[PDB]
From a paper:
Both E3s are positive regulators of TGFβ signalling because they mediate the attachment of degradative ﻿ubiquitin chains and subsequent destruction of negative regulators of the TGFβ pathway, such as SMAD7 and SnoN/Ski. Previously we reported that the RING domains of Arkadia and Ark2C are bona fide ﻿ubiquitin-binding domains, and that docking of the RING domain onto a regulatory ﻿ubiquitin molecule (UbR) enhances ﻿ubiquitin transfer.
Guided by the structure of UbR bound to the RING domain we prepared a fusion protein (referred to as UbArk2C) in which ﻿ubiquitin was linked to the N-terminus of the RING domain of Ark2C (residues 255–346). Ubiquitin transfer by UbArk2C was increased compared to Ark2C RING alone in both discharge and multi-turnover assays suggesting that ﻿ubiquitin occupies the UbR binding site. Furthermore, UbArk2C behaved as a monomer suggesting that an intramolecular interaction was favoured. Crystals that diffracted to 2.5 Å were obtained and the structure was solved by molecular replacement, with residues 1–74 of ﻿ubiquitin positioned, as well as residues 259–274 and 288–344 of Ark2C. The loop contains stretches of basic and acidic residues and is presumed to be flexible because it was not resolved in the UbArk2C structures reported here.
Numbering used by the authors: 0 to 74, 86, 255 to 274, 289 to 342
Write the structure that this text describes.
């Protein structure tokens, strides 16, 4: 086995015990196992290109100690439209630790709740974080602008 690194926009780095013959889908799956991010929300970038799910790491030049970037899989204050364009709204599904709390209101996230992931990968209740973003388009935790790109 071997190890590779996955970095978010905050500089946070995750270590992944992988195989060279693992699919990008499997990589997103262990990212979900470690950090609870659904694979449909993850866009992995490596060397300035996007990484398709049905392909293997060893297709893509992923040796030991390689670092991929984990961006948000998207298609001053921010208006509601700006917020939707730069974040991932969804209903929460607890995965079978597994507990996550909205750091604004301190309540646990429950199945079905309207939640929002920001491009830094931080996750909140929609109701809690939209009030914040209408005041300042930065993440309350890490202060990353919801429009920053790369
Ligand atoms: Zn909340
Ligand atoms: Zn953040």
């Amino acid at each position: 086995s071997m190890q590779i690194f996955v970095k978010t926009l905050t500089g946070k780095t995750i270590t992944l015990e992988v195989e060279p013959s693992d699919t990008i889908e499997n990589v997103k799956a262990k990212i979900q196992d470690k950090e609870g991010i659904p694979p449909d929300q993850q866009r992995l970038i490596f060397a300035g290109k996007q990484l398709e799910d049905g392909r293997t790491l060893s297709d893509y030049n992923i040796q030991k100690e390689s670092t991929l970037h984990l961006v948000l899989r998207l298609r001053s204050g921010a208006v509601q439209n700006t917020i939707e364009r730069f974040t991932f709204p969804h209903k929460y599904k607890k995965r079978r630790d597994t507990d996550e709390k909205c750091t604004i209101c301190l309540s646990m996230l429950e199945d079905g709740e309207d939640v929002r992931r920001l491009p830094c990968m931080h996750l909140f209740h929609q109701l809690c974080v939209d009030q914040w973003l209408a005041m300042s388009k930065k993440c309350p935790i890490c202060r990353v602008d919801i429009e920053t790109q790369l």
